[PDB]
Amino acid sequence: ERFQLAVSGASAGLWDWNPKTGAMYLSPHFKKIMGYEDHELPDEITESIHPDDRARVLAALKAHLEHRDTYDVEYRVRTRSGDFRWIQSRGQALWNSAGEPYRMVGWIMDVTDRKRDEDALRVSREELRRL
């Protein structure tokens, strides 16, 4: 509620997902972060994860939808232009009294540049230890 000031000014994209149907609402900035203009994708879609992250991500979604464990992951997605970016994705599901998810709401942020510099550092450290 004070929320929309939040998800907006961080340059975040909002998402609202139905677990049974697969349907997803996307904010204009979500579409943008995927590399798409507002009109280049509908406000609702019903495959882009990097092959190396796919298992990790799906597993964390399961840990959330089943064990309630926190959902907050970083991973690579293929943008409109087939180029990969890193996003952080965080969200919270809603369950009925039967323990089943009927909704999940969250956001994404583009964290590519931080991930670039972390790996750059990481590689510098490896190489120094090889000397």
Can you tell me the distance from the alpha carbon of 107 to that of 16, in angstroms, rounded to the nearest whole number?
9
Q: Is 24 helix (H, G, I), strand (E, B) or coil?
A: strand
Instruction: Quote the tokens at residue 85.
Output: 């970016």
Residue holding tokens 């495959």? 47
Q: Is 107 helix (H, G, I), strand (E, B) or coil?
A: strand
Q: How far is CA 43 from the centre of its chain?
A: 17
Domains of the chain with CATH codes: 1-110 (3.30.450.20), 111-131 (6.10.250.490)
Burial of 5 from C-beta contacts in 10 A (0-12 / 13-18 / 19+): exposed
Residue from 75, 25, 87, 81 nearest 50 by CA: 75
Q: To which H or E segment does residue 95 belong?
A: strand 84-95
PDB resolution in Å: 1.5
